[PDB]
Structure formats: structure tokens, C-alpha cells
């Protein structure tokens, strides 16, 4: 509801950004290894087995709870058996929608002060974000980044409208339906990502401040958090824990500020991120002076408050991620704070100053500085788009674990755009596993071999008579694979083959182990293969096992596995589900969550209080 040039300008700018961003995300097509882990859970859920990684166990492997079910719905609607295309389409659409939403939300912030004026809208903070090459790397992978972008854009627009909605129509701020919708949207943040709660919850607090009475506060708090409470109850009843389990596997001991600073420097130095920040701060502090240099309830619901809320949210997210320790990818975890910090300057107005503040030649010089600053920002973006990137250090393991994943997997395979699971069959140990499985009708345990790029085989116990014969379509024994990269194996082997890792993403035994040494980020807490041999229907004697395994350790682990307290936790996720199982799992989730075991079997025996088995000799 403003003048014609203001209406058209904004529109064209938006279109431009969208187009470019789309192109920038089509020339870099790939799917990550971590993106193929969601698809196995989706396949299990569409097969009638439930939200699990393996059919016989109830283990949570996805930390989004919304991306997984959205992809499940998409794969249910689409009758095609390919799920990578669903993920590609959804990620692209969500990223573009989020950028459009944030631009439209920022325009309404400046709209009220442009009444009866001639001005234009120019894209400032939207171009900067899409100029960064890692932003276009992760705009199309199998992760949930686009979902985060869309959620943040919607929340920003709704909060701006809520802050500006104060007009006192009938002694009330806004309508009740809008308040309920905003409360539900704010409460829905913990499901999307856990650390995002600090954003959404903050918004909720503001609403609770502005309510006139206690009745409205109770209504808002009840409406806001119904769905997260229901899902928490379901998770406690079904999985027997208070947390997804991947967070349970890590056993933190404190802050790591030095690694976070190293990660921040590594992110900054390819692209020189300080110059756009300085220029955008200059533009922001310059645009405010033209508008003019110049109880708690009125103050909280004001346009000045939402800007501070967004900036504080961005700073808090950055501090949390820096204290955590960073990541082993180039720029993955520092994009959400960057998106949050650039929201208030996503689009800027350019206009001739009023006659009542500066006369004639003083207004002709105020627009020139704004134009020159915008031109400098555009030049920086154009330069930084065509940047080589991290450099010739993203293909090996250096002193730090940070690496560029897209080029790593492009050279690991032989494809410039690895998009499907058939493209990942060219990994060095991928074609051999199929033949290894096909050559063992009675089943086996597969381990990496230290001499070549094939697999070592540990056979299983043969079936007894009258059980081998009573089989449908022949008899197939149990197959288990022990490895570190799960997505490529999980999307290839099949739904009746058990795929386990060592850190504890899908291994319930390795997630209950304690920590002794810090080591490298993410590649520091690995379980011995002797534990894997100990549990499973496989042989345990030297004529059938490789020479780098210790049989005394195998016997000690086998004897330690019969602890009464370990048995309860094991059957919490393996016994058939019913009503009493749901109730017992709800009552004992807290104590199951805070349970730890020791890596070395002898010390475990010592802790539990069980006798030591005699030497095999």
C-alpha cells in the first residue's frame, strides 16, 4: 500500500536474487554421505518396520524429526523408488522460499516510514549471503539447511507483523488467531533443531511479558508447547531415552575455545568476511540518521525490540557453536548465525532526503554516499563469487580435521555430480561387499582388511537340522557389516542386513561408553572389533578369526555382557512393544539415559563384580 516505484522495484529485485541463487545451486549438485542416512530410515518406515535404522532395534538416528517425516511424505506421494530426487527438489524449494520470505519480511520493516516519498529498494544482505560459495554448496545437499532457512524467514516476517500490529482496535494488540498461530510457530522450534530452541523460546518470553493478565499467559504457554510435549512422551515410551542417542554417544568434558577460534579463522580467511560487515554496519548506521535521531509492555512490543532480538539470537548461536568446538567441515555450522545477523539489512531503501531536515545540496550528497557504499558491496560480492575456495588442503588429513566434503567425495568417486547411491559404488570398498555377501549363503561378519581393499570374513554358527529345512525360498544366514561410513552401505546392502558403526550413531553398545582421551573432533571414540565379535552368532576361536584380534578380550567381553543392569537397557529397545513396555520405558528413561560402561572388558568385569574367565591356553 505505497507508491508505484516502491512496489515495482522491490519485486524485480526479489526475482533477480531468486534466479541467481537457483542457478548457483544447480551447477553444484551432490548428496552427502550424511544425507543417505535419512533415506534408510525413510525406507524402513515406508516398508512397515517403523522409524528405525535396523529392523530389530529401536534406535533414533535422525536429529531433525521434521525433515525425516517431510521426506517420508514426499516419498509416499511419489511412487518412484528413488528418494534422492525428492530430497534434491525439497531442499532447493525450501532454500529459495526462505530467501524470498526474509526479503519480504524486511521490506515491511521500512515500509511505514516511506509514506508519501519517492524511493527504491536495493538488495544488500541477500546478495552477500548467496555470494558465498559454501552457502551454495549446502543449499542442495541431503541436509535440513533449507528447512531452517524457511522456518527462520517465516518467524522473522511474523514477528515483524506482530511488533507493528499495535493499533488498539478494541483495547487489544492483535487478533486471537494470530496470537495462537505465532505461539505454535514459536514452540515448534525445538523439533526442527534443538539448539534453535534458544531462539524460539526467547520469542515466547516476549509474548508472556506483553499479556495483560495471568489467564492469557497460561493460555499462551499451554498452546505453545503441546506438540513438543507429546513427541517427548512418545520418544520416552518408544526409544527408552531422553535424547536421540547421537548426543548420548559423545561424552563432553568442557569447553574447547581454541578449536572454535581455529574453525572461525579457517572460515574467514578464504573470503575476507570483515569488509562486507564493516560496509553494512556503515550503511545501517547511515540510514538511521535520516529517519531522525530520536511502560514495559509497550516497550517490548515495538519495532526496535525485534531487531535487537534477531541480533542477540545470532550472537548467541555463534557463541554456542564456537564454544562447542566447531566442525570438521569447511563452513557448515556457521551459516545460520550469518543468516540471522544479515536479516535487518536484507534490503535497503534509497531516497532523497526531506526538505525539513537538509536543504538542497545537503540532500544531493546524502544519496551519493549510499550509492557508493552499495556499489562497493556489490563489487565485493562479484569478486567473492568466483573464489577458488579453501585451497589445496581439502583432500588430506592435516593438523586440523577441517576438510571440504564436496570436492573430497568428488575425487573419491569419479563423478562431478554424485547424486544417487549408484554413483557411490565407485568408492574403493563398495563393489567387493556385494560379492562378499553373495558368496556367504549362511551369513558372516564383515570387517575391513588391513592388507588390501577387500573384506575379512568371520563365519556364523551353522543352523541345526529341522530348522534349515523349514525355510521359505531357501535359508539365508545372518549378515553383519562393521564399518564407519553408513549411508553408502545402508542405501545399497538391503533391509535385512545389519549395518553398524563404531562411534555410536547406530550402535547402542558404543553410545554407553565413557571417555578417557580428547583426540580429534569426531574421530576419537571408536570401539574395538572384539566387542562386535563377542555379541553376535559368530565363531570365536583362532582357527576362524583374523590374527589382529585377541581371544581373551573376546571371552572377557562375552562374560561381561551378562550384567543384570546391561540386560535391562538392552531389552528396553529389543523386546516386543506393548502397553506395559511403554509404561516401563517411560518410568525408567531417566536412569537409562545416565548409564555408562567401560571400554576395556577386564575393568568392566572389575566394576560389575563378576569373576574373570580362565585363560584359553
Amino acid at each position, epitope marked *: 500500500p505505497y507508491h508505484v516505484w516502491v512496489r515495482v522495484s522491490l519485486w524485480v529485485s526479489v526475482v533477480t536474487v531468486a534466479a541467481l541463487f537457483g542457478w548457483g545451486a544447480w551447477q553444484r549438485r551432490w548428496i552427502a554421505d550424511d544425507g543417505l542416512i535419512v533415506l534408510r530410515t525413510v525406507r524402513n518406515l515406508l516398508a512397515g518396520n517403523g522409524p528405525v535404522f535396523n529392523a530389530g532395534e529401536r534406535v533414533e538416528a535422525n536429529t531433525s524429526t521434521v525433515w525425516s517425516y517431510l521426506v517420508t511424505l514426499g516419498g509416499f506421494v511419489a511412487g518412484s523408488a528413488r528418494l534422492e530426487y525428492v530430497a534434491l527438489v525439497l531442499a532447493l524449494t525450501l532454500s529459495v522460499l526462505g530467501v524470498v520470505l526474509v526479503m519480504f519480511g524486511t521490506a515491511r520493516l521500512y515500509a511505514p516510514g516511506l509514506t508519501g516519498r519517492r524511493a527504491v529498494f536495493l538488495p544488500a544482505g541477500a546478495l552477500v549471503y548467496i555470494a558465498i560459495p559454501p552457502a551454495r554448496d549446502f543449499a542442495t545437499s541431503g541436509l535440513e539447511n533449507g528447512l531452517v532457512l524457511a522456518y527462520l524467514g517465516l518467524l522473522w516476517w511474523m514477528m515483524v507483523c506482530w511488533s507493528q500490529g499495535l493499533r488498539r482496535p478494541d483495547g487489544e494488540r492483535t487478533s486471537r488467531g494470530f496470537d495462537a498461530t505465532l505461539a505454535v510457530v514459536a514452540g515448534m522450534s525445538v523439533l526442527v533443531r534443538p539448539e534453535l530452541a534458544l531462539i524460539g523460546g526467547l520469542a515466547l518470553v516476549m509474548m508472556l511479558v506483553a499479556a495483560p493478565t495471568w489467564r492469557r499467559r497460561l493460555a499462551l504457554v499451554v498452546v505453545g508447547g503441546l506438540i513438543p510435549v507429546a513427541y517427548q512422551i512418545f520418544r520416552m515410551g518408544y526409544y527408552g531415552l531422553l535424547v536421540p542417542g547421537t548426543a548420548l554417544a559423545k561424552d563432553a568434558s568442557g569447553a574447547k575455545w581454541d578449536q572454535g577460534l581455529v574453525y572461525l579463522a579457517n572460515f574467514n580467511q578464504p573470503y575476507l568476511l570483515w569488509a562486507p560487515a564493516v560496509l553494512l554496519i556503515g550503511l545501517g548506521l547511515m540510514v538511521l540518521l535520516l529517519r531522525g535521531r530520536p511502560w514495559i509492555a509497550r516497550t517490548v512490543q515495538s519495532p526496535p525490540a525485534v531487531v535487537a532480538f534477531m541480533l542477540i539470537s545470532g550472537l548467541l548461536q555463534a557463541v554456542y557453536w564456537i564454544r562447542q568446538g566447531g566442525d570438521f567441515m569447511h563452513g557448515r555450522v556457521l551459516l545460520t548465525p550469518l543468516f540471522c545477523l544479515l536479516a535487518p539489512v536484507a534490503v535497503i531503501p534509497l531516497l532523497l532526503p526531506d526538505r525539513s531536515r537538509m536543504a538542497r545540496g545537503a540532500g544531493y550528497l546524502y544519496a551519493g554516499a549510499t550509492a557508493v557504499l552499495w556499489l562497493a558491496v556489490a563489487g565485493w560480492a562479484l569478486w567473492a563469487a568466483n573464489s577458488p575456495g579453501m585451497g589445496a588442503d581439502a583432500t588430506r588429513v592435516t*593438523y586440523s580435521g577441517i576438510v571440504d566434503e564436496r570436492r573430497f567425495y568428488s575425487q573419491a568417486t569419479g563423478h562431478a555430480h554424485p547424486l544417487t547411491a549408484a554413483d557411490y559404488l565407485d568408492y574403493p570398498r563398495m563393489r567387493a561387499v556385494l560379492t562378499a555377501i553373495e558368496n556367504t549363503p549362511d551369513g558372516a561378519l564383515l570387517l575391513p582388511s588391513g592388507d588390501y581393499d577387500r573384506w575379512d570374513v568371520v563365519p556364523a554358527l551353522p543352523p541345526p537340522p529341522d530348522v534349515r529345512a523349514a525355510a521359505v525360498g531357501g535359508y539365508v544366514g545372518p549378515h553383519t557389516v562393521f564399518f564407519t561410513n553408513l549411508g553408502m552401505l545402508g542405501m545399497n546392502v538391503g533391509l535385512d542386513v545389519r549395518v553398524i558403526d563404531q562411534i555410536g550413531l547406530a550402535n547402542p553398545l558404543a553410545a554407553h561408553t565413557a571417555r578417557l*582421551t580428547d583426540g580429534r573432533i569426531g*574421530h576419537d571414540k571408536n570401539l574395538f572389533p572384539d566387542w562386535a565379535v563377542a555379541e553376535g552368532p559368530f565363531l570365536k576361536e583362532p582357527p576362524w578369526i583374523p590374527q589382529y584380534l585377541d581371544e581373551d578380550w573376546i571371552r572377557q567381553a562375552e562374560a561381561a555382557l551378562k550384567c543384570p543392569e546391561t540386560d535391562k537397557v538392552l531389552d528396553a529397545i529389543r523386546a516386543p512393544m506393548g502397553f506395559r513396555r511403554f509404561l516401563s520405558n517411560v518410568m525408567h528413561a531417566a536412569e537409562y539415559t545416565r548409564y555408562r560402561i567401560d571400554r576395556v572388558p577386564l575393568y568392566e568385569l572389575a566394576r560389575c563384580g563378576l569373576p574373570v574367565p580362565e585363560p584359553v591356553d
Partner: antibody
Amino acid sequence: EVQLVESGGGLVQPGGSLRLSCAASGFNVSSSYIHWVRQAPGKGLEWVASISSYYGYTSYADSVKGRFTISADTSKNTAYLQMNSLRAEDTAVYYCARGYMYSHWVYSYGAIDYWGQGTLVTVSS
Amino acid sequence: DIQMTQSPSSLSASVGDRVTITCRASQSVSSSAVAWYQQKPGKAPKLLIYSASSLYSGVPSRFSGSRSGTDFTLTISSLQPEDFATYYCQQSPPYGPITFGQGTKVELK
């Protein structure tokens, strides 16, 4: 070329503390086993402690189990050995060494490949 | 606890002779991870034999090892003047503790 450079050592009062360092070149300490071995004057060899960063495993001898401490700083490729309550019979030349690993995965043959030069520690006074 | 008894303790041999050193354990040695080392006075040890029957890279062919049940043996045929040192037998499981033996010394006459 693989190199192991050792530093930190001298005279210490009985009941004192002294730390040892070892810098590695040519390989990553995150995928190999590191051992400490000492040799008392006119005596044989004696294993002290070992560490594995890939597995989070740490082991000590029975004589120095509660008083010594071995760690690793993968950011600088360095290994450490803290020594506390140094009784007078802890004087010897201390060696750092690397294990002989399999080529295609993280397994060991049970032997030692490369030995450092050594750094003597005198715990008498 | 595993203990290794190395014998003999001192050998007198001349140039171009055959030398045999035997290291003996007590318990089961199914690990078969016995390794042999060489150390000259004032230097660090050098690896010669690993897995009790396998010869390391760069080591001359004169050195050999054999597993006679619980007994282990090192063999040198036609020693050269650059072979007079002190030797050690070592045992270790895949993760377990390292155990050494009492060194032997060879002289020249």
C-alpha cells in the same frame, strides 16, 4: 622423513614433578600407537606407557600406574608424559617410539618401528 | 604376568661363524608377536625380525628367526665385523603390555 624429537629433562628433587614432550613429523599421531620406554644405567629395556587416539585407549605399567600420565595433542602432533612424585629410583634414559601398523587399516603387528634419540631424567638430588 | 628368559648372556664368536640365540617364554604365546632388536653402545635399537618368522625391510638376509613351540630362536650365519651388538627379545599382544628380555652380548675372539 619420519622424525621424533624429544625435550624436557634434568635434575628434580625426590617427590618432584617434570613433564616430557615429543614432536612427530611425517605421520599423524591420530592413526598410530605411541609408546614410552626407558633404560636405567647398566640395565635393559622397560616399557612405561602407551596411547591410542583412534580408540581412546591408554595403558600403564604396574610400577608407574598411579603416578604417571600420558596424553596427546593432535593439533600440534605432540605426545606428553607427566611424571609426579618422582622417587629416586626413577632415573633413566626415556625413549619415545612408534608402532608398526597395517597398511590399509588401523591394526598393529605388536612391534615398534622408529625409536627416538632419548632424553635422560635424573630424579635424585 | 608373562616372563621371557633369554639365554645365553655372552657369546664369544669370530668372523664367519654361526650364532644362535634362544628366548623362552612361560605361558601361551599364541600371539606369535615375538620381535628381535639390535642396539649398539650409545644408540637406539633397530628392528630386525617381526612376527617371529618375518624379516623387516632393509635388513640383510643373514638374519633369521624360528618358532620351536614355546622356544624362539634367532640365527646369524657368517657374521661380519659390523654385527657385534646387544640383542633383545620382545613379546606383545595386539593391545596388551610390552615385555622385553635380558639382552645378550657378542664379542670377538
